[PDB]
Amino acid sequence: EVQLQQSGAELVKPGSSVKISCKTSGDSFTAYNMNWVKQSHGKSLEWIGNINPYYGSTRYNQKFKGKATLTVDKSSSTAYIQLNSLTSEDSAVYYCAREGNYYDGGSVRYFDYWGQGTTLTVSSAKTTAPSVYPLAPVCGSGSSVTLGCLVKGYFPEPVTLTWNSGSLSSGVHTFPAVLQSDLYTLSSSVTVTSSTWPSQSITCNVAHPASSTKVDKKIEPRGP
Amino acid sequence: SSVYITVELAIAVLAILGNVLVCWAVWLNSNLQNVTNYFVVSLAAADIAVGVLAIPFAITISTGFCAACHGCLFIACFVLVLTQSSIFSLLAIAIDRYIAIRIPLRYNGLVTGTRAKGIIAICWVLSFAIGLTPMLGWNNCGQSQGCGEGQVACLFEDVVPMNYMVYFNFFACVLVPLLLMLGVYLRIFLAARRQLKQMESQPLPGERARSTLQKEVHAAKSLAIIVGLFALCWLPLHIINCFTFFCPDCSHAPLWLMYLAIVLSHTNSVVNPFIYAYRIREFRQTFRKIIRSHVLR
Amino acid sequence: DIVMTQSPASLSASVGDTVTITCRASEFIYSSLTWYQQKQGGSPQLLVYAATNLADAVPSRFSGSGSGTQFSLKINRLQPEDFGTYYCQHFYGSTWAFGGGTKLEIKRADAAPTVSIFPPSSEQLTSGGASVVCFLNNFYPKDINVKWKIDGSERQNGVLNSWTDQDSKDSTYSMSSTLTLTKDEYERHNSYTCEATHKTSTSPIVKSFNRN
Ligand SMILES: CCCCCCCCCCCCO[C@@H]1O[C@H](CO)[C@@H](O[C@H]2O[C@H](CO)[C@@H](O)[C@H](O)[C@H]2O)[C@H](O)[C@H]1O
Ligand SMILES: Nc1nc(NCCc2ccc(O)cc2)nc2nc(-c3ccco3)nn12
Ligand SMILES: CCCCCCCCCCCCCCCCCC(=O)O
Ligand SMILES: CCCCCCCCCCCCCCCCCC(=O)O
Ligand SMILES: CCCCCCCCCCCCCCCCCC(=O)O
Ligand SMILES: CCCCCCCCCCCCCCCCCC(=O)O
Ligand SMILES: CCCCCCCCCCCCCCCCCC(=O)O
Ligand SMILES: CCCCCCCCCCCCCCCCCC(=O)O
Numbered sequence: 001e002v003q004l005q006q007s008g009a010e011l012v013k014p015g016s017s018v019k020i021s022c023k024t025s026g027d028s029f030t031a032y033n034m035n036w037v038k039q040s041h042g043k044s045l046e047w048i049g050n051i052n053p054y055y056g057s058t059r060y061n062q063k064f065k066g067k068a069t070l071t072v073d074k075s076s077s078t079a080y081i082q083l084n085s086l087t088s089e090d091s092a093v094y095y096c097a098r099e100g101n102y103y104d105g106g107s108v109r110y111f112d113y114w115g116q117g118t119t120l121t122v123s124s125a126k127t128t129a130p131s132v133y134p135l136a137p138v139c140g141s142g143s144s145v146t147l148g149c150l151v152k153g154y155f156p157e158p159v160t161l162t163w164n165s166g167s168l169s170s171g172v173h174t175f176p177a178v179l180q181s182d183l184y185t186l187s188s189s190v191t192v193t194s195s196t197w198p199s200q201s202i203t204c205n206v207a208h209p210a211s212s213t214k215v216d217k218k219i220e221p222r223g224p
Numbered sequence: 225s226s227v228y229i230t231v232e233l234a235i236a237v238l239a240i241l242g243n244v245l246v247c248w249a250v251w252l253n254s255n256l257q258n259v260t261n262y263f264v265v266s267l268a269a270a271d272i273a274v275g276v277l278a279i280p281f282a283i284t285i286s287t288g289f290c291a292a293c294h295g296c297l298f299i300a301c302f303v304l305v306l307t308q309s310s311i312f313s314l315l316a317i318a319i320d321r322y323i324a325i326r327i328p329l330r331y332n333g334l335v336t337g338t339r340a341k342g343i344i345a346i347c348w349v350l351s352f353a354i355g356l357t358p359m360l361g362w363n364n365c366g367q368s369q370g371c372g373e374g375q376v377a378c379l380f381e382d383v384v385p386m387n388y389m390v391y392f393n394f395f396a397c398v399l400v401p402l403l404l405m406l407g408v409y410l411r412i413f414l415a416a417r418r419q420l421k422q423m424e425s426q427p428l429p430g431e432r433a434r435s436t437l438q439k440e441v442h443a444a445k446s447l448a449i450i451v452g453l454f455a456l457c458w459l460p461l462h463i464i465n466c467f468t469f470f471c472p473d474c475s476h477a478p479l480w481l482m483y484l485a486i487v488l489s490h491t492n493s494v495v496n497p498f499i500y501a502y503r504i505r506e507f508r509q510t511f512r513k514i515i516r517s518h519v520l521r
Numbered sequence: 522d523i524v525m526t527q528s529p530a531s532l533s534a535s536v537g538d539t540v541t542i543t544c545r546a547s548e549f550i551y552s553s554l555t556w557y558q559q560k561q562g563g564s565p566q567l568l569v570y571a572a573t574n575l576a577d578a579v580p581s582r583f584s585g586s587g588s589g590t591q592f593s594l595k596i597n598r599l600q601p602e603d604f605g606t607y608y609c610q611h612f613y614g615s616t617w618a619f620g621g622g623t624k625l626e627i628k629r630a631d632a633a634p635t636v637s638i639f640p641p642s643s644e645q646l647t648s649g650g651a652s653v654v655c656f657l658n659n660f661y662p663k664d665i666n667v668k669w670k671i672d673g674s675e676r677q678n679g680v681l682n683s684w685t686d687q688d689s690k691d692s693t694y695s696m697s698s699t700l701t702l703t704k705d706e707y708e709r710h711n712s713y714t715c716e717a718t719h720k721t722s723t724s725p726i727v728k729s730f731n732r733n
């Protein structure tokens with residue numbers, strides 16, 4: 001029933017600092033060291049450091065010395081990590097983990113409980129609503145037809161992309177966004193029986209709350 | 225007694241090697257460095273002293289030396305303070321395991337390195353103050369003959385008071401700690417079985433991991449076995465002295481038996497490293513590393 | 522500082538067969554090594570500790586082993602719930618480090634990509650950009666090659682690729698490939714081909730168009 005609840009996603013300019021928090025519920029906070037881990041590009045894990053909640057005593061990985069600062073408010077059962085002089089390379093997901101300890105004759109250590117994680121995005125890009133371009137088959141077939149939606153030049157993530165308001169479900173692939181210069185670009189394709197299109201209306205829906213936009217593009221046969 | 229001497233030598237060499245091995249392990253591998261293992265290191269050292277010292281003094285006193293009362297009482301009773309320190313550490317360990325297992329949430333701040341330091345220092349002091357009662361002026365002296373004028377030969381049985389070995393030693397400074405130690409340990413065990421049996425009826429993670437519990441409890445049993453063997457060691461000797469004393473003008477013990485309890489109690493300091501190697505993976509792996517390294521070096 | 526090296530970096534396997542992951546330490550950590558399991562979009566979960574010890578509720582089909590510098594995690598009769606990425610971490614010393622991870626992916630039958638090419642939408646040309654997009658859909662194995670040709674001449678620049686994870690339905694992979702050009706650059710040319718090569722054919726799957 002123990003839970004480590006981390007603070008929400010963070011998006012900032014380079015040069016600034018951030019404080020991520022982890023609140024612990026369902027046990028004693030002061031009984032275990034709190035650790036922080038950085039996951040980069042969905043893969044590599046790195047141990048940032050750890051802190052003793054009772055004394056506020058800390059040990060840092062050398063690489064993060066001066067970048068990270070760990071702290072604790074025992075009153076609220078909350079541990080913080082603060083990152084300073086942020087650069088893009090600091091963009092990652094940060095985890096708090098809890099260290100378990102026992103004596104088997106050695107000191108036995110593990111991270112038994114992890115937080116849900118916290119996303120940190122560091123960019124100099126400005127909030128930009130996307131350009132949504134419908135993509136239809138080359139002018140002038142088969143038993144099936146493939147349509148697409150190109151969402152270009154936005155920031156920040158995410159966007160929500162459906163088809164026919166989610167009423168069009170099967171056959172969809174939405175691809176991960178990529179960065180072109182400062183901005184994201186993303187596409188989606190849906191494949192349907194050729195009896196379905198263009199007999200029936202097929203529309204790409206794209207929302208980008210950051211810029212508070214909602215856009216719909218009907219896919220239409222190219223001229224003629 | 226030829227065999228006996230080559231024996232007490234075999235002992236000294238063993239105890240020294242095995243315990244030096246424990247201390248070199250604990251220094252060498254960071255995982256073994258912790259309060260429990262500082263007390264364990266205390267045990268090792270106190271069992272090294274017996275190898276380098278207590279056995280030579282066990283080997284002089286057989287041949288019936290002669291010297292000043294007190295300077296004689298040293299070689300007479302030294303292994304006394306050692307044994308006592310062994311007990312003090314055993315107990316510190318039982319208590320440490322007790323905090324760890326019974327109150328795991330307060331162990332962090334409660335048990336510390338420096339406090340370990342202090343309790344160990346103290347325990348050595350007291351191991352001395354208690355260890356040799358003679359040195360403080362408490363006197364069996366003043367009641368061979370022509371041995372010397374300013375020199376009164378010092379041999380255990382007569383120059384060592386049995387009104388103490390059976391009272392201020394067996395009854396007070398050994399049986400009691402050993403006993404509340406048996407208590408603390410059985411309490412740990414019964415309690416852990418209770419909360420495991422409980423975790424079972426309520427699918428985890430109810431409070432803490434079961435696996436973890438079982439593991440540190442197995443480790444506690446391995447540590448309590450050391451106590452058990454200590455007892456199995458000094459117990460025969462204290463039985464001998466025990467009933468030989470309550471019937472002082474009643475009968476006494478032979479050469480061919482009485483010369484065991486000395487050997488045996490002297491063996492108490494040989495087995496620890498073997499028990500570690502057998503029951504504990506961290507030590508075993510470290511001993512294995514030290515030996516598999518510095519042999520072929 | 523002590524360095525963990527984990528292999529293989531990725532392994533595909535079928536439900537029911539046996540798999541082994543290896544961690545190798547640059548120094549002697551004895552038994553203090555931990556295995557974590559991360560499922561897509563999840564957080565690392567404790568799997569093994571002290572190198573041999575199963576966490577609470579982890580199925581017996583999991584086994585840790587090794588010591589010193591060499592360790593392995595082994596899963597016996599694979600279950601679908603077992604696919605994900607696995608990590609090793611040493612707890613030895615004052616400073617700790619993770620393995621690079623092992624990604625455990627489902628093996629399925631080879632599949633050919635469905636390849637379709639889309640010329641720049643008009644709205645975009647209006648905007649002043651030109652983006653030719655190619656989709657390559659539902660192929661296995663993941664390994665695929667995309668070649669962009671303009672008027673039969675290869676084009677490596679302005680190309681940006683993106684790959685899905687395994688599909689929630691059929692366990693296949695898909696990839697989008699985008700060729701961006703300034704509108705004028707786009708118009709200076711005539712035919713555009715997006716040409717895929719993949720294990721499942723001895724000749725390139727080719728989709729092309731002309732601007733008429
Ligand atoms: C000749 C000498 C013989 C000496 C041998 C000594 C061995 C005895 C070990 C007793 C250990 C526990 O001692 C005490 O017992 C009771 C239960 O029995 C414990 O009580 C515990 O168990 C009971 C149920 O059985 C629970 O209701 C209670 O919640 C729980 O705390 C106390 O918490 C503990 O303080
Ligand atoms: N009673 C006793 N004797 C000896 N050595 C004496 C050897 C001896 C044996 C038989 C004999 O007739 C005369 C002397 N060492 C002894 N050590 C101890 C002892 C140490 C700690 C507790 O008891 N007791 N003890
Ligand atoms: C500095 C000592 C080196 C010892 C080398 C050989 C070993 C012989 C006896 C010494 C062992 C004593 C144990 C010391 C425990 C270390 C505690 C710590 O570093 O936190
Ligand atoms: C009169 C005799 C003089 C004795 C001199 C030395 C006495 C030693 C008493 C205590 C033993 C020290 C244990 C060694 C290391 C333990 C400390 C540690 O590493 O944590
Ligand atoms: C001479 C004594 C005769 C009977 C022996 C008694 C058993 C040995 C140990 C003593 C009893 C158990 C006491 C338990 C102490 C519990 C500590 C605590 O408060 O947490
Ligand atoms: C009257 C008491 C005097 C001396 C006390 C003796 C102590 C009793 C021994 C207790 C030790 C526990 C041993 C646990 C056995 C473990 C079993 C196993 O896994 O192999
Ligand atoms: C009268 C005083 C003597 C003490 C009575 C009994 C104490 C003796 C302890 C017995 C030791 C048991 C050995 C268990 C072997 C462990 C096997 C294993 O590795 O799992
Ligand atoms: C497991 C616990 C071990 C107990 C250790 C000491 C036990 C002592 C044995 C005998 C009890 C008292 C000894 C005195 C004998 C006196 C008999 C007599 O001659 O009247």
